Each structure stands twice: as C-alpha cells, then as structure tokens.
Amino acid sequence: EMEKEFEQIDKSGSWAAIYQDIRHEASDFPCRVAKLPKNKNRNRYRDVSPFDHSRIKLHQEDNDYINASLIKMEEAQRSYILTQGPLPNTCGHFWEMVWEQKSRGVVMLNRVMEKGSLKCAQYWPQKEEKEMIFEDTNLKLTLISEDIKSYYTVRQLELENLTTQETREILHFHYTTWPDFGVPESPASFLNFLFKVRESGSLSPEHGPVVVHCSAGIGRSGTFCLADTCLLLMDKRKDPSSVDIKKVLLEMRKFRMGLIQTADQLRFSYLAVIEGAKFIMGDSSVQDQWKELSHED
Numbered sequence: 001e002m003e004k005e006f007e008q009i010d011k012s013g014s015w016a017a018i019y020q021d022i023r024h025e026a027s028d029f030p031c032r033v034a035k036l037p038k039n040k041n042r043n044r045y046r047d048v049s050p051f052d053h054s055r056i057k058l059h060q061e062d063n064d065y066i067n068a069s070l071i072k073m074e075e076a077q078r079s080y081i082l083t084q085g086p087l088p089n090t091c092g093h094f095w096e097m098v099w100e101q102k103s104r105g106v107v108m109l110n111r112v113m114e115k116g117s118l119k120c121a122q123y124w125p126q127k128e129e130k131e132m133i134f135e136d137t138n139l140k141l142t143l144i145s146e147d148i149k150s151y152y153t154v155r156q157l158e159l160e161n162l163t164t165q166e167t168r169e170i171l172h173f174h175y176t177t178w179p180d181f182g183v184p185e186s187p188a189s190f191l192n193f194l195f196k197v198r199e200s201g202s203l204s205p206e207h208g209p210v211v212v213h214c215s216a217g218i219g220r221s222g223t224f225c226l227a228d229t230c231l232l233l234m235d236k237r238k239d240p241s242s243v244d245i246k247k248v249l250l251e252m253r254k255f256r257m258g259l260i261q262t263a264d265q266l267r268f269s270y271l272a273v274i275e276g277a278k279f280i281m282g283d284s285s286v287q288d289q290w291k292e293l294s295h296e297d
C-alpha cells in the first residue's frame with residue numbers, strides 16, 4: 001500500500017536507495033536507429049534516445065526517425081507519446097507525428113529557456129496573426145486562442161494538413177513552473193494541471209496518444225505519466241491498494257529510458273497519486289480545493 005510504504009520510506013529516509021534500485025532494474029533495449037549517423041542532428045541529448053521497439057516512426061519514405069517513444073500501458077489501457085523538446089530542425093517532424101498519430105493534446109512540461117540555455121524550440125505560434133508553416137512536412141499551425149494562468153497556459157491550436165486540407169484542433173497544455181530535475185510547487189498544483197488535461201478529452205481513447213514532453217522527454221514527462229496511470233489503475237478498480245507505483249514505473253521504462261530523473265520526482269509521484277486518490281474515491285470536491293491551492297489565478 002503506497003501510503004504506508006511512503007511513510008516507511010520517508011521515516012527511513014531511503015528515497016535515494018529506492019530510486020537507485022529502480023534504475024538498477026530498469027529495462028535496457030537497443031536504440032540502433034537513434035544512434036545512426038544521419039539522426040545525430042535529430043537528437044537533443046546524446047544519452048537520451050528512444051528504444052527501437054517503441055520508437056514512433058514518421059510516415060515518410062525519406063527518414064522515419066524522431067526521438068519519441070510510445071508508452072503503451074496495457075493494463076491501464078492508456079498510451080502516451082513521450083518525446084524530447086523539438087529542435088529547430090525537427091519542429092516539422094514533431095507536428096507530422098501529432099498528425100499521423102491522431103493526437104489531440106500536447107503537454108509541455110518545460111520552458112523554451114531554462115537556466116540560461118534553450119531547452120526547446122518555439123514549435124508553436126505565439127500570435128494568431130503569425131501562423132507557422134512547416135514546408136518539409138506540409139503542415140500549417142495557427143494559434144486560435146489561449147487561456148493564461150499563473151503557472152500554466154492552455155492554447156487552442158489548429159493543425160492543418162496542407163496536402164489534404166484536413167483540419168484538426170490541438171490543445172496545448174504548457175506547465176511553466178516545473179524545474180528540470182525539479183518537482184511541482186505542490187501535489188495540488190500538479191493535480192489541478194493533470195485534471196485540466198483530463199477534462200479536455202486529450203487523454204481519452206477516442207483520440208491518438210497525447211504527446212507529452214519536456215526537454216529530454218523523460219524526467220518531468222515520466223512523473224506526469226506515472227501519476228496519471230496510477231490514478232487510472234486505481235480508478236477502474238476503485239482500489240488504491242491494488243496499485244504498485246514502483247512496478248508501474250518499471251513497466252513504463254520498458255518503452256522509454258530514464259522516466260523520472262530524481263528520487264524526489266519519484267517521491268512527488270507518490271504524493272500526487274496519494275492526494276489524487278481522494279478524488280478517485282468519490283470526493284469530487286478536492287478538485288476545487290486543488291484549484292484554490294494551485295493559485296492558477
């Protein structure tokens with residue numbers, strides 16, 4: 001049971017050991033394609049690559065590579081696409097993936113500039129009169145509207161396949177206050193954001209996998225996905241005790257490496273899941289409490 005386990009680990013102060021063991025058990029699969037010479041410039045970080053078995057292939061005869069993985073959670077029946085922050089040369093690929101995978105939402109857990117360095121390209125339009133056109137993938141992207149909150153912004157975008165002129169609505173959820181290798185202000189702050197994504201239908205099975213990313217697409221992205229999945233699992237069963245957080249993370253790591261970068265990010269995952277359990281268990285009011293505590297206004 002996660003809560004008793006949390007108190008135990010917290011009391012013993014062994015989060016570092018717990019986290020280290022997970023890393024020791026983490027799966028190791030080939031990343032041959034990611035390491036191919038022609039893809040070097042398609043990778044942001046040398047040591048963060050997608051496993052060949054779960055990588056997302058771009059539907060193009062030229063080069064189907066993109067540093068992105070499909071985290072297909074069988075038991076929970078939810079899939080996510082974890083990817084790195086797109087590079088200046090991979091923004092068109094990023095949107096090609098969103099189109100081809102039929103994703104409705106994109107969760108950005110990082111900022112374009114963090115710690116004096118550019119951790120992601122500005123792959124989306126910031127002004128409605130300034131739409132973006134990715135000639136390479138033949139896609140056009142337009143900002144339609146945006147809801148700016150204190151620690152996050154939700155943007156409504158329109159992605160158009162210029163080739164077929166088909167149009168789709170993309171919801172962009174941008175958490176702006178989550179430090180790399182850091183954690184959210186509080187479980188309330190995180191859950192308020194997670195539930196904002198849930199309510200949009202972006203995580204629903206009637207859409208392609210939600211695209212989740214940060215700079216590397218593993219730390220903050222891993223934390224977001226683990227919490228959501230653990231909440232989903234106990235939801236379908238309405239049984240919090242049936243969920244084993246560490247086991248869930250290990251299964252996720254069979255699809256992409258390094259999910260959850262710090263022992264504190266793992267610790268926070270427990271906090272977020274424990275708190276979120278309240279809602280899952282029939283206390284819908286907590287959702288409003290999280291909104292208050294998040295100070296989104």
Ligand SMILES: O=C(O)c1ccc2cc(C(F)(F)P(=O)(O)O)ccc2c1
Nearest residue numbers: 045180181214215216217218219220
């Ligand atoms: O160069 C590397 O080897 C490398 C490895 C892991 C990283 C993890 C993050 C993260 F955890 F903060 P993120 O949440 O963006 O996934 C950011 C940058 C990283 C860079």
